[model samples]
Target: HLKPFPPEFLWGAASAAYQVEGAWNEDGKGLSVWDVFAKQPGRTFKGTNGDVAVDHYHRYQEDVALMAEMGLKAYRFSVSWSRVFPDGNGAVNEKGLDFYDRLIEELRNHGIEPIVTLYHWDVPQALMDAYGAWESRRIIDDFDRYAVTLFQRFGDRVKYWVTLNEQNIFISFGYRLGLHPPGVKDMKRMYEANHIANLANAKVIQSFRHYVPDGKIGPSFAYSPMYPYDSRPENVLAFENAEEFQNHWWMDVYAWGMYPQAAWNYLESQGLEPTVAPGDWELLQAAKPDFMGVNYYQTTTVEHNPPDGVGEGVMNTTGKKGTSTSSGIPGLFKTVRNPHVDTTNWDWAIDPVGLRIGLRRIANRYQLPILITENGLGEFDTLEPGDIVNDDYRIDYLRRHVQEIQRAITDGVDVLGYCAWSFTDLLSWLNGYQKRYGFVYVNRDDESEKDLRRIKKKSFYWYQRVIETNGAEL
Candidate 1:
């Protein structure tokens, strides 16, 4: 039989501050990049913003009761940066800061671990307007100040800290692809901005060791293992290139505090190398993460491309099938559909085995314990009569992934915990409300809020059973 999950294994569910905690501008909270971005005419799906997303800022008590009823051992959530320091730097908002203080004590009362994420793509708009934000080094000190504030305030209760969630996604989407806030499609600027963020991340981690000496901290990476399109040697090489460029480029910085050599060389040739300061390398190398926070989704297949071949294609932000186009870089690698794996309506590959493979790779490469910071299925759910949601597809999706996690643990990965992507229906950045990814269904949609009632889906009970058994019965 598969080795049983650790007795104290964290059976958790997660949510981002901007996605779950509404009251965006309330209680002295400053504006966030997303606050402006989502309000733009054509930026978000159906022009939906998290202005009053599920009203979690007000209804957290009701939500926490639901989480407790599900027997969750942990609750992972992020703190809105602008909420604490209204302008992203000066003056602290004690009222905004104490909101989390209350939430932490409540979760503790229910015996649920609180895993805090410092930044989950909620950059303070004030910082962005002030020196180009991540594009400038000023953000490093500001982020350091924010991190120190949090560590000093809540380190005693929050043992697990995620420095930044999905750095690659935000950096690329914001600058490289121009999909996120302060949107600018410039590769050179994107690389430099990312490098500056790297410094900021390291500075925060360094501060964490001093403030939260006994706690664990790391960045949550959006990781998707790359596989070769076929046995063709060229495709295999392409897959390796993809991994180094996409995966290693970020993880290597977090783990070893350096950029991948081959990717750096390629960047040098293309004039895309980020300007690194003298102390940056030393700073990055000094801060070591206790565990790699992996947000596993789906693995992609890669194929070789010529210099003039396919470039970046459209993404399937919409839930319609076959809408996403082939995306990649010329003269490197392109993403192709894994013909062997089935895809969701959102066009994401539903490969459960990829989870085990990803865990094993991280464990062996980083030689550190692993924490699954986020993983979930974003599907369309129909709320049937009598407030019942028969979402068996989500149940199957989570159960299979949970099974693979156990297999990976048996293979010797120092598995720490698993926090599902979300606990309640919240805003989905680019994908609007219909693409639900939660055990509890919130009565709301892109058009209007329908009472904002929290209805438990079928997977809610299924996951309750899974967690109650310590993952032994999944």
Candidate 2:
């Protein structure tokens, strides 16, 4: 038997502004990098974009009603920076801010706590065009002000604040891979912009202390636990390097106000180190977060790679099994297939044990209670004759992961809560609308927006029971 979840466990679901809330340009909202990136020809799969993604902006009340029916304790959602700051600065958009105000009020009326994410990979296009966005230190002031505005307006009600969502992914993919918005593939530029982002994140957390002293705040890290390919000494050492570069690099800055020495040394050797200003360390160290928000998907296995062996994370956007390739830095380590685990259609590992491993590692390393910001299986759901969706596969995935979470709790990891990846079927950033990750199936696709009806999947009812029993039923 495992330890039971806390009585106040926040059984919740999450959604990003760009992924779920459509109405890209409605109501005086300025354009986000995503609004432009997705509109570019060949930028996303089949040219699919979130221009009208699930109409969540228009149907949030219905969405909240569905969650209320599911007995959800919390709802984790992001406020689009472009929506709040139409030009990313200057005048505030009342109409844009009013939308979230109404939504938050509705959630509170239903007794559901609001967990608001400050940013979710949607840098206003205005910021990008004006001063190169994160590439410039000016973003620090703008983002801090934006965050303070939210705190001043919503702090009394919103207790949990997520400063940034998957900073590692946004920085790496946008600056280094040219896969996301404001795309550029220069190492120097990537490091410079990433450093600025670090300052911005710290500044927001620091301000949160002043604005909402009683609230808990943290950044959502896309954490994948690193594993060695085998018992070989070289492979083990490679795993260590990968762990330092991938995991410790950002987490160290957030928790301890310093980058991992080894990772920094490696970056310096490559002439890709970011410029750190005076007082930066003080700011980072001073604003210690109350928890670690982890968006865990799977564990990665690494092995020693030759200097000539290099690969990029060319993800499987086609949703075809076995098509995704393993990628890694040439001199450090390369990701390898874990023969002991199974994979999904997108080739992501389906290892529930990995969740437990990730939680335990973060607990021991950071010594902070972990809030699982996101974990979900994205699969293709078909509508049957009676308009029913039998998603037993997704149910199994979540049930096993929930069980592993309990196991981690038994192992002495203090998990604050778990937020499923999404609440409704919405636009996947790169994979388009085909890869659905949600409890409620929205009737729409990339090719065309159908009636956009919200249908409850089989897992919706399953999760209802899980949340009702506080995971005891699962």
Candidate 3:
């Protein structure tokens, strides 16, 4: 039997400013690295950009109204730093601050709690131009200033704050893979910039203690738990390596304020260790978080890889089934197919049980309250006549995940809440507009805006009931 959800559980959905808010340059909003990167040829799907993403900037009232109808308990959204700081540090943009002020008021008007995310992969282009952004240590103070502005301006209204949204994804993709903004492909630079990012994360979180003394703050990690391909000793060792490098590398710093010794030693051996200044470790240890924000979509399966094995593999940005290939470290572990699970159109493995496993691991390892910040299925939903979208698949996906969450609760995990990846259809960073993940479907495509109407899918009503019953039906 599963445990019933706590009465205060935050049943909600999430969205990033750049992914959903279209008016990229409106109201003194400055350009972000993503704003420039998305427009570059061959950089994004169909050369698509969030120049007018779902027009949520202009239509948030309507969207929030629909969210109110769905009985959403909390709404997790991000603040674009460029929108607030314009040049990343010179002057304040009152208009930009006003926009979020109104949005927060509206959400509160509808009795919904606002969960604010400070950074979500959208760095100010000015910072990138002036100091190469995260690559330079100068970013630590600049980011601290930007974060302090948010804390001073909106910290009173937003009790649940996310310091960084998926720092691991942004650092890995931006610096190592050359996939995201500020694109660069060098292991040394990746680790260096990543260390700087870790410092920045600690700085802002440390400041949070003094600024938002009553609130909770943490970084949202993109965690994909690893599983050994088999029980063989080599495979188990590979799994350990992968978890240390991939999972503990970021999480350990957040939870324990220190890097895992094994992972650090391995990176040092490979000459990829990040340079840590004196007192860096002390600063990290001082800024412990109140909770762990986990953004889990799937678990990874790993097998042993030889020293000269594959280094990296391609990602499936297209919605074609079975298009994703295996990727791994040269001498550590490689991702492989988990034959027991099914996969989505975009090649994401569907494993509800993995979520429970991940929650348990975080609880046992960090002993911090876990907030499921992002978990959803991205797929194609057809809008039929009468503005109806029958996304039964999404309903089933969320239902199963919720059930697993209840099981985790029964297993004694300090589970805080579950916020679906999105509340409405928005731009998928690399996959563009086609990869839909939302209860409400917005009518838009890569090339056209096509009325930009909001239509509630079948999952919308289903989730409304789930929130109403507090997961009892699930």
Identify the runs in model 1 with alpha carbons over 4 angstroms from their true place: none
Candidate achieving higher lDDT, 1 or 2: 1
Q: 301-415 in candidate 2: lDDT tens per residue?
A: 9999888895686688888999877799888899999999999889989989999999998899989999999999998889888879999989999999999999999999999
Q: Lowest-scoring 10 consecutive residues by lDDT in candidate 1?
A: 310-319
Q: What tens-digit string does per-residue lDDT give for candidate 3 at 113-183?
A: 99999999999999999999999999999999988988998888999999889999999999889999888
Stretches off by above 4 angstroms in model 3 are none
Q: What is the lDDT of residue 214 in candidate 3?
A: 97
Q: What's the lDDT for all of these models?
A: 0.93, 0.91, 0.93
Taking the candidates one at a time, how many backbone clashes does each contain? 0, 0, 0
RMSD of each: 0.7, 0.8, 0.8
Q: Candidate 2 has which clashing residue pairs, if any?
A: none
Q: Which pairs of residues have clashing backbones in candidate 3?
A: none
Q: Model 3, residue 46: what's the lDDT? A: 92
